[model samples]
Target: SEYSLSVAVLADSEIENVTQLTSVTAPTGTDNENIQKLLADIKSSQNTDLTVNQSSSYLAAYKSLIAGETKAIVLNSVFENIIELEYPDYASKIKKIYTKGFTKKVEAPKTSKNQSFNIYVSGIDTYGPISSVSRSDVNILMTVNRDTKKILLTTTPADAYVPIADGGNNQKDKLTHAGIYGVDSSIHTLENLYGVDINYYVRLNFTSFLKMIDLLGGVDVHNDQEFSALHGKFHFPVGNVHLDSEQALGFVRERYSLADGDRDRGRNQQKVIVAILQKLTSTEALKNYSTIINSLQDSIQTNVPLETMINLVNAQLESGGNYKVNSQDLKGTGRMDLPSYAMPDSNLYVMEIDDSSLAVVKAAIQDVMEGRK
Candidate 1:
């Protein structure tokens, strides 16, 4: 396991880099073996000019840096994300001077062509500038088995009540809240829930999807029933409909306008995914290959290396094969009294997991990962 910390300051703090920081601030002593130790190391390191200012609390330290009273502040990703989500306006106001990663060497795993792997796709809900970390609204664990030509899409309800893995108390919270800490938190939490390991992750925001679909020249989504919303601003008709990038965004976003509400919204998202894949698999993708790849670098965050995608493009053109895809949305009972980990002051609605439902999902994940039918 590895730990990391970032030194950040206000955009106009006049401190461009860590070397220039003569003064730094953070709450001196705190919980979590890491958060405090990392700050201590930063303070003691002679690598930079450092004058330490001890604050009474985190708020004081956070505010001092934001006000430019302090040159920089060291914090983990969790604190940074909470700041971003709590104050959307601050997302652009703060700039990370530099990040340091502390790692312990461990053996790396090998990837085989016939072996199966799991991908955790998280669609964080943010309309403005995308935060590196936030509450993940769409959490889907994609188990891909190439040998069986099977791709199993298992979606966990964002509100599903589950124990946060790294949170270190066995305290249950909304599954979506895991992303507020980091991608590792989300992956580990899901792994704890399903008893499976995730190999890769793709974290994206709404803006990226718009850009992606636009680059793909829109998608043709087939609807079972017609829907309209946003003040008659956006409308989708029955059967096949050509949705431009803007329309496609609205297509999968409309829940209240649908017959089954949130359930139908999930269904629409699946439809949009299928349509986008269909369009990409077509020869049309080759025509815009370079354009899409260039745009993707700016639009989304993924751990999967570019070389893998490069091979994918060549293989897609060389040998076309079909994926036997199947999808399942875990069912749960809704409760209105659970306090989420991120926001524990008030009662928040959450989805309680059904053991049978979770068992089936777990079994499916195992089967898919093991390349079993």
Candidate 2:
């Protein structure tokens, strides 16, 4: 969808019985194109002249409807989500009169032996089902250069303070919270932050993560620091260590006991990821293609089309070569902040990104994608 708008009113408003709305309020300026398009659609459909008042702020426009000063208000659909989050009873107190959807065609990225692309890999923290949208606890940008047979895994901490795309007023929220709105929100937000276009996305939850790891008969991950976590149930000796399903889960999820807290955990997650990639590309693993396909069907959700995947498999089979996997983690200082996205009522620890660190990471990605490395 290109853009959209929703016309909302107070629950007790009597305007629902009317054939046309005489007045509405919306944010000021032509930048509010969604609202303007909605107004035009309404005017043409209802055949009535609608008076519109512009507010300098979205919050103010939302408040105007609650104050009973306006019959209805028009805004981008995503803005409505703010009401649901801020006011728990908003869904019951407010009614959506109508919605207008705008469509635009997006061109698909061209893929070939010489092309490079980025995929957003999100690991959601959930158990019941893998399809439901939830907080993305793990965010990794996988950049692949088919020509060089190289891949770069860039991991970003969940608590990184970033602008939530399509979020109301473009508020700066935790990167994890973007997943609450869905994968699209998370992908778009990251795209804006990295100044890069994401060609595809792959999402999975905790259940799937464990299954995928065990399905490969466990992975051998390298650990830089020796520590025991999960109440000492899982321990590492600071060298190349083998991890089972539960062991790998504890490996990536344990942070409280680490010296650097979540930063160390981020590095561990990358280690586990690199191990999995290595295992997947092995000729021995290829022998169990049917079983692996079944496992992936139940555990993974991705936008990569089947034809593209098939082409990739063919390319790999035709040109047999080893892949060079490199991992990079974005680092930051931990600080406690009030009004956090995770705990709205109290102060919570968050990672404040380092500008220099981010610039270096971006440069590395650019160099690799442009065939400079």
Candidate 3:
């Protein structure tokens, strides 16, 4: 029973062995180098705002886990898959707490590069740091191609029965909390359920979202039908409209009106994201960048590098005239079974990724990157 098959991933293999914890001993040769590369990639991929302790070993890694010093841990699916192979029992217990929070000071990459990258953006509805898992209401996968100056946005309903970050329960309350397990878990879910590998992620919560929107003098978006829920009246008078933070929040949160429920709301949320992107492009946001920068500590948290922001802004300015926006919506339905109670009393949606459709998406990204139509 003690050998429930638990493996601890480490940057090195010479870690002091723990009593119950088993170290499968990652290949001692390239583990350090690859892990270092991973840490750096992760640092830049997220946003580059936090800090990292790359030298920690497996023993120390487990120590931190047991002590509760770190509530979440991130690892690639390759590593997780291996662990699952070795410790088939406890492997299922692992959870992927995917993060878009960067952990390094902003600095330019060693090489000058303007390349394309995929980022899974999750807008969770919750409080506290971006670390804690909250109800994720928004799921948008973005493909930014600096080469062709194109951005693709795909929206997935939050109630999908995709895989969570790590392992444990195959079923979860919401697809948004998939990050609670790890970005790897969410990525695997997408890959297995839909066959797509999410290269990166960016997560935001209600607090930062509200602050960011409000700073923009509130974002203006519209709805087809008039509905009321969290806020008050959800009505947009058809034409050019304006919204304060609270009102904008109302526009995105209303669901009871449309017959399609969250499905319709998902599209609306995508529209809001685009609107925010459009608004930020104006000189108004840049002029007030100081206001946002000043309140950065309280209003936002991300894994993106400070330098990347500079690069992204520059890229936006340079390609502003030529860039195009595209989007995709995955398909699925909500269901609940009696025996397992996979999602008791909850309406859950599943993401169905077919081959031809996914190929079309990948090709689109490839086109954006290669500048080939």
- Which order, best to worst by lDDT? 2, 1, 3
RMSD of 3: 11.8
Best candidate according to TM-score: 2
**What does candidate 1's lDDT look like per residue over 1-373, in tens digits?**
4656777788776777777867667655542465555656655663555665776434456667767687677766556555554455765777887776776453232354456888888888776555544588888887877667678888888888999766423469888888776677788888788988787788888888888888888999788998985567887788889989889888877887778776677777777777877777776685566667787777687777667666666766777786777888878898988766555445888999999999899888888878777
Worst 10 residues of 1 by lDDT: 104-113
User: What's the TM for model 1?
Assistant: 0.75
My TM-score estimates for the predictions, one after another, are 0.75, 0.78, 0.60
Among all candidates shown, the one with the greatest lDDT: 2
lDDT head-to-head 2 vs 3, winner: 2
What are the lDDT figures for the candidates, one per model?
A: 0.73, 0.76, 0.54
Model 1 alpha-carbon drift over 4 Å, by segment: 1-31, 36-39, 42-77, 83-113, 128-133, 167-170, 286-290
lDDT of 1 at 288: 64
Off by over 4 Å in 3: 1-114, 128-132, 168-174, 182-184, 191-200, 287-291, 338-372
Cα lDDT tens digits, model 2, 1-373, are 3556777788888777224677778875533666667777877877666677986545567778888888788766554454454555766777877777877564354453447888889999886567655679999998888888788888888988877775423566778878876777788888887878788888999888888988898999878888887799988888889999999998989998888787789888888878887787777665555577687777788777768776666676667687787888777777776355423455666777889988988988887787776
Over the stretch 1-373, how does candidate 3's per-residue lDDT look in tens digits?
0001122333332332232222222222323544445445544655433233432333233345444554323343333433332244534444332222223333222222447766677776775565545445777877677766778887767765554543324544456546544554555555455444555556677777777787776776655655565745556555556777767777777776666777678777877877888777776565555465676555454445556666666656655664588777765545644211122333444443345755675566566645566
- Candidate 2: clashing pairs of residues: none
